Write an enzyme that holds these catalytic residues in place. Structure first.
Site, mmCIF file in Angstrom:
data_model
loop_
_atom_site.group_PDB
_atom_site.id
_atom_site.type_symbol
_atom_site.label_atom_id
_atom_site.label_comp_id
_atom_site.label_asym_id
_atom_site.label_seq_id
_atom_site.Cartn_x
_atom_site.Cartn_y
_atom_site.Cartn_z
ATOM 1 N N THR A 79 0.836 -1.195 0.000
ATOM 2 C CA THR A 79 0.000 0.000 0.000
ATOM 3 C C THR A 79 0.876 1.253 0.000
ATOM 4 O OG1 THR A 79 -0.173 0.186 2.423
ATOM 5 C CG2 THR A 79 -1.748 -1.231 1.341
ATOM 6 N N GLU A 80 0.225 2.410 -0.151
ATOM 7 C CA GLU A 80 0.867 3.697 0.119
ATOM 8 C C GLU A 80 1.471 3.726 1.525
ATOM 9 O OE1 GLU A 80 -1.966 6.839 -0.562
ATOM 10 O OE2 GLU A 80 -0.600 8.469 0.044
ATOM 11 N N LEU A 81 2.654 4.326 1.653
ATOM 12 C CA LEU A 81 3.342 4.405 2.936
ATOM 13 C C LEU A 81 2.895 5.673 3.649
ATOM 14 C CD1 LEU A 81 5.285 3.465 4.953
ATOM 15 C CD2 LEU A 81 7.185 4.355 3.722
ATOM 16 N N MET A 82 2.388 5.533 4.868
ATOM 17 C CA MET A 82 1.945 6.669 5.674
ATOM 18 C C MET A 82 2.969 6.832 6.792
ATOM 19 S SD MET A 82 -0.721 7.552 4.116
ATOM 20 C CE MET A 82 -1.285 8.695 5.358
ATOM 21 N N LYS A 89 -11.958 3.493 12.548
ATOM 22 C CA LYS A 89 -11.546 3.841 13.905
ATOM 23 C C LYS A 89 -10.243 4.610 13.816
ATOM 24 C CE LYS A 89 -10.351 -1.061 14.255
ATOM 25 N NZ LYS A 89 -8.914 -1.247 13.864
ATOM 26 N N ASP A 101 -6.684 0.245 5.981
ATOM 27 C CA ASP A 101 -7.209 -1.072 6.363
ATOM 28 C C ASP A 101 -8.500 -1.433 5.642
ATOM 29 O OD1 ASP A 101 -5.047 -1.288 7.955
ATOM 30 O OD2 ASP A 101 -6.111 -1.261 9.872
HETATM 31 N N1 LIG Z 1 0.117 1.961 4.819
HETATM 32 C C1 LIG Z 1 0.789 2.056 6.065
HETATM 33 N N2 LIG Z 1 1.783 2.948 6.242
HETATM 34 C C2 LIG Z 1 2.394 3.012 7.462
HETATM 35 N N3 LIG Z 1 2.129 2.285 8.557
HETATM 36 C C3 LIG Z 1 1.114 1.383 8.369
HETATM 37 C C4 LIG Z 1 0.389 1.214 7.152
HETATM 38 C C5 LIG Z 1 -0.552 0.171 7.419
HETATM 39 C C6 LIG Z 1 -1.544 -0.382 6.544
HETATM 40 C C7 LIG Z 1 -2.510 0.562 6.048
HETATM 41 N N4 LIG Z 1 -3.498 0.262 5.243
HETATM 42 C C8 LIG Z 1 -3.549 -1.073 4.912
HETATM 43 N N5 LIG Z 1 -4.507 -1.686 4.074
HETATM 44 C C9 LIG Z 1 -4.181 -3.063 4.018
HETATM 45 C C10 LIG Z 1 -3.064 -3.318 4.788
HETATM 46 C C11 LIG Z 1 -2.645 -2.087 5.379
HETATM 47 C C12 LIG Z 1 -1.628 -1.711 6.211
HETATM 48 N N6 LIG Z 1 -0.422 -0.236 8.687
HETATM 49 N N7 LIG Z 1 0.596 0.496 9.252
HETATM 50 C C13 LIG Z 1 1.055 0.328 10.675
HETATM 51 C C14 LIG Z 1 1.272 -1.166 11.052
HETATM 52 C C15 LIG Z 1 0.412 -1.435 12.287
HETATM 53 C C16 LIG Z 1 0.152 -0.062 12.888
HETATM 54 C C17 LIG Z 1 0.039 0.864 11.686
#
Ligand SMILES: Nc1ncnc2c1c(-c1cnc3[nH]ccc3c1)nn2C1CCCC1
Ligand code: NA
EC number: 2.7.11.1
Length: 269
Positions: free
Chosen positions: A90-93, A140, A157
């Site tokens: 996915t896109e990196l946040m 959430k 998610d």
């Molecule tokens: N895109 C992200 N960028 C940075 N951190 C991320 C994420 C995600 C994440 C975000 N959206 C998602 N959709 C399907 C799997 C998935 C995983 N999860 N996480 C972290 C991993 C557990 C706490 C949050």
């Protein structure tokens, strides 16, 4: 970093590289920094710990998710089974979830609440206006994500929950299916807004899900609702979490609300 110099795994198609740089972990996912080899954009490489029916429905789910491009939706790139775990790219946040981001701060600023909530609503509106509509069903603060350095807020998610009374032998199949409409996302949005506005988890005074259910099917608000200072914020939240779904504000109503309109910027000082 040296770690950024050496990939440790590649996607089946060769499009994405994994680096041994762990960005986050939860009960369900472990997220590493990855790279898109065509664009050199850094991505999130998420490893998750099924029948051919569930495998086919999953691939169809993922193909639709790939089309969902919007500034307030975490973009979905690809998925596959590795051997063992499931990988979603996915896109990196960069700053994780809004839940964790809120742990660094004491009291919400009105400009920030405005700005984050507006972005969440636009993401939900984008999902609700797909053909056919997509209902998040699991919104959430722990699956709403933020990039610290831009203040971009994006819903994530999506589809994750659906990726992981009677007597079963005598139960018609349609009794397993759950249909929700847009209003369950509005209710969840209201609770997110309450959490952001109070720096406090809603219904924290309850010990178990049943206590919340007794409160939530009796239609009595969480104690934190009353700890809301601004009456207009209280009214927006109240309109989102109304017990009867037909009485709830719509997403369009919320986005047209003057509360969420953008300001004219911060004066230079
Ligand atoms: N895109 C992200 N960028 C940075 N951190 C991320 C994420 C995600 C994440 C975000 N959206 C998602 N959709 C399907 C799997 C998935 C995983 N999860 N996480 C972290 C991993 C557990 C706490 C949050
Ligand atoms: Na490690």
């Amino acid at each position: 970093m040296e770690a950024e110099m050496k990939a440790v795994a590649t996607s089946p198609s060769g499009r994405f590289l994994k680096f041994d740089i762990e960005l986050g972990r939860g009960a369900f996912k472990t997220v590493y920094k990855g790279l898109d080899t065509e664009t050199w954009v850094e991505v999130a490489w998420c490893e998750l710990q099924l029948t051919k029916a569930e495998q086919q429905r999953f691939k169809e789910e993922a193909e639709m998710l790939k089309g969902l491009q919007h500034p307030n939706i975490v973009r979905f790139y690809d998925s596959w089974e590795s051997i063992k775990c499931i990988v979603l790219v996915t896109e990196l946040m960069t700053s994780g979830t809004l839940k964790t981001y809120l742990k660094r701060f004491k009291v919400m600023k009105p400009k920030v609440l405005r700005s984050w909530c507006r972005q969440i609503l636009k993401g939900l509106q984008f999902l609700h206006t797909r053909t056919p509509p997509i209902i998040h069903r699991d919104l959430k603060c722990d699956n709403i994500f933020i990039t610290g350095p831009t203040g971009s807020v994006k819903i994530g998610d999506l589809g994750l929950a659906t990726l992981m009374i009677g007597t079963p032998e005598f139960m018609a199949p349609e009794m397993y299916e759950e249909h929700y409409d847009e209003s369950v996302d509005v209710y969840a949005f209201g609770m997110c807004m309450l959490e952001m506005a109070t720096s406090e988890y809603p219904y924290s005074e309850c010990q178990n899900a049943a206590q919340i259910y007794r409160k939530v099917t009796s239609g009595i608000k969480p104690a934190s609702f009353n700890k809301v200072t601004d009456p207009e914020v209280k009214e927006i939240i109240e309109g989102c979490i109304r017990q009867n779904k037909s009485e709830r504000l719509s997403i369009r109503d919320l986005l047209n609300h003057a509360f969420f309109a953008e300001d004219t910027g911060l004066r230079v000082e």
